Design a protein around this ligand. Structure first.
Ligand SMILES: Cc1ccncc1-c1cc(N)c2cnc(NC(=O)[C@H]3C[C@@H]3C#N)cc2c1
Ligand SMILES: Cc1ccncc1-c1cc(N)c2cnc(NC(=O)[C@H]3C[C@@H]3C#N)cc2c1
Lengths: 289, 280
């Protein structure tokens, strides 16, 4: 439910095309009037299904108006099926791409991080947290431009918090550090910086560190006292400025991890020559490789 | 270990819900064979039991005198029933509502017995998370006991390879450590002294937000007169603002208030006697 939801059938305005992506129901679609391409995320919805999560997710997306975040074109409601209409990105995600091209070049990774940091600075300026930064959620269009997508996990966290906030009851025995986690969450937007650092390793190595480890064992490894941030594996392949970018983004203490704005001044993402031309090259490798 | 794949209604007669949602789905029940009374707590399951048996084994390997007795557990139609000791007198909140305010010596004994229970749970990397009068049980032997529901959300997690360490910490523990129990015990002592925690009449949200301000100062006992230096000091240190400075359960057990002589179950049997008089 949304206060600007179009109360009509999206198929009156769009021609459905193929289904997109694992980890979605997302469809490529074409505006019947304009022939423009879009992406339509359909989710069937009984009237008894709780709307809280879908309500927050639409809200999070409509109040975004930034180039590095997939544009929003309204939502629909018809026939017990909700639809979210957003910008379409012809090349899909960076994960879809590197599974074909192999590891990106350092300059390509540098451009991608700058564009992601720009989007994160905008999200964090709205006090939004993405919380699922990864190769699979960084979309690339035919022009080689970078857009951030998939606010599902961000919506889930916000939905449950507001619910845990009004199902609070008697917190009069609650310690101060617990109440801070109750109201604010236990972590802040700097988690997106860490995730970006992991994504940089992912685009260099085709998987995040510890990808071959059982996920539960990973949660325990990262919570141990002596846990050390991960590092690039093939050190000789990369410059010191890239290593430092990983080191600083992967600062273990969130009280010392630089913000998105600060990172956008780092040497790796402030060097000259970073433009979508680097990704047009990557996309040509994808086509002609 | 014995988890029964049986309907617990085969063995017990349910009698009445206990508490008022403060405990959840908890029932007084009678053993159909003997007449023994027990308390049966129901907890819903998903189709997700391996770890379940591990936590059960720990619950019956326990014979700590400050943990409620565990008799068994039933699994039936995706619902887990935990069979426990039944305390006729209920909680300390059940008691002081009829009795009134506890005495400083009675409060000191409770704090000692609760601290021992807390030291046990913390030694298992369990956090109680809900220390308060309503959750401190008193059996007819005069024993002060805590319930161990540590046995009792991958949605938040999903895949963890990209998440920050602090996000993983929130996903596992929850953003804090067992020292939150020490704060809740300090508040509980005040509850036992005044029949309410500090700020009971303020709106939950308001109270929550006031604590996050850096201008927050811990609460204190209402009437400075009725209480001794030891009690006041016990409060001060248990209600330490920063968890990095809050004393552990083991350390708090050496505090003067819970070490003094004369702490014995007589204090609690006296309380039950007063309760018995109030109900006639
Ligand atoms: C990632 C995600 C997770 C969860 N919900 C939605 C999305 C999501 C959102 C959007 N706005 C998208 C826009 N465009 C694309 N483009 C393609 O998938 C190219 C490969 C197809 C062709 N041809 C995918 C998109 C996926
Ligand atoms: C604390 C807790 C937290 C969450 N879930 C269950 C319990 C719990 C566990 C147990 N083992 C109990 C055993 N006995 C009682 N007794 C009464 O409530 C007497 C006053 C009623 C009458 N008549 C309550 C019990 C509550």
């Amino acid at each position: 439910v949304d206060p600007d939801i179009f109360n009509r059938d999206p198929r009156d305005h769009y021609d459905l095309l193929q289904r997109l992506g694992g980890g979605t129901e997302v469809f490529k679609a074409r505006d019947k009037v304009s022939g423009d391409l879009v992406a339509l995320k359909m989710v069937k919805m009984e009237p008894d299904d709780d709307v809280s999560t879908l309500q927050k997710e639409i809200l999070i997306l409509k109040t975004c108006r930034h180039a590095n975040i997939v544009a929003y074109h309204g939502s629909y409601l018809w026939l017990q099926k909700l639809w979210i209409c957003m910008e379409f990105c012809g090349a899909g995600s960076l994960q879809d791409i590197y599974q074909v091209t192999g590891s990106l070049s350092e300059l390509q990774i540098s451009y991608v991080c700058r564009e992601v940091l720009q989007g994160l600075a905008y999200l964090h300026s709205q006090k939004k947290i993405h919380r699922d930064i990864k190769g699979a959620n960084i979309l690339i269009n035919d022009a080689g431009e970078v857009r951030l997508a998939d606010f599902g996990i961000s919506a889930q966290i916000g939905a449950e918090l507001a619910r845990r906030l009004e199902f609070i009851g008697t917190p009069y025995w609650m310690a101060p550090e617990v109440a801070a986690v109750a109201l604010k969450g236990g972590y802040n937007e700097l988690c997106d910086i860490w995730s970006l650092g992991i994504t940089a390793i992912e685009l260099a190595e085709l998987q995040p560190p510890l990808f071959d480890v059982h996920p539960l064992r990973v949660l325990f490894l990262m919570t141990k006292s002596g846990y050390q941030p991960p590092r690039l594996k093939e050190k000789g392949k990369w410059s010191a400025a890239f290593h430092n970018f990983i080191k600083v983004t992967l600062t273990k203490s969130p009280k010392k991890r630089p913000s998105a704005t600060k990172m956008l001044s780092h040497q790796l993402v402030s060097q000259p020559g970073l433009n979508r031309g680097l990704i047009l090259d990557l996309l040509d490798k994808l086509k002609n490789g």
